[PDB]
């Protein structure tokens, strides 16, 4: 049919059984990634926003959401600079 109406164990679950599980792990990463993803295309709203990776820069220059999502991944792994930290 269209979708296997199930969400159990000891049964013939599809390969999508692992998908719903794996996304939870990387969703934790996504929470920090959103800071960079939004910073790249949306911005921050800061005076000292002048960062290599920012939309809210005093230059007013940004990227598209696809360009920002892939780069936010690349910023997550290096832990890039962020106008909204926590002391």
d(CA 16, CA 72): 26
How many angstroms separate the first and last alpha carbons of the chain? 53
Which residue lies nearer to Zn ion by CB, 33 or 44?
A: 44
Which residue lies nearer to Zn ion by CB, 49 or 69?
A: 49
Question: Residue 28's closest CA among 64, 76, 82, 65?
Answer: 76
Judged on CB neighbours under 10 Å (0-12, 13-18, 19+), 6 is exposed
- List binders of Zn ion among 5-34 (CB under 5 A): none
Which residue lies nearer to Zn ion by CB, 44 or 80?
A: 44
Encoded one letter per residue, x for contact with Zn ion by CB under 5 A and - for no contact, window 32-51 reads ------------x----x-x
Tell me how many residues contact Zn ion (CB under 5 A).
Answer: 6
CB 26 within 8 A of CB 73: no
- Residue 83 interacting with Zn ion (CB under 5 A): yes
The residues of the shown chain that bind Zn ion, judged by CB under 5 A, are: 44, 49, 51, 54, 56, 83
């Amino acid at each position: 049919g269209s979708h296997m109406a199930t969400a159990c164990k000891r049964s013939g679950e599809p390969q999508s059984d692992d998908i719903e599980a794996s996304r939870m792990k990387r969703a934790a990463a996504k929470h920090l990634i959103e800071r960079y993803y939004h910073q790249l295309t949306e911005g921050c709203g800061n005076e000292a926003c002048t960062n290599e990776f920012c939309a809210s820069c005093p230059t007013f220059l940004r990227m598209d959401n696809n360009a920002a999502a892939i780069k936010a991944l690349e910023l997550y792994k290096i832990n890039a600079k962020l106008c909204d930290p926590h002391p």
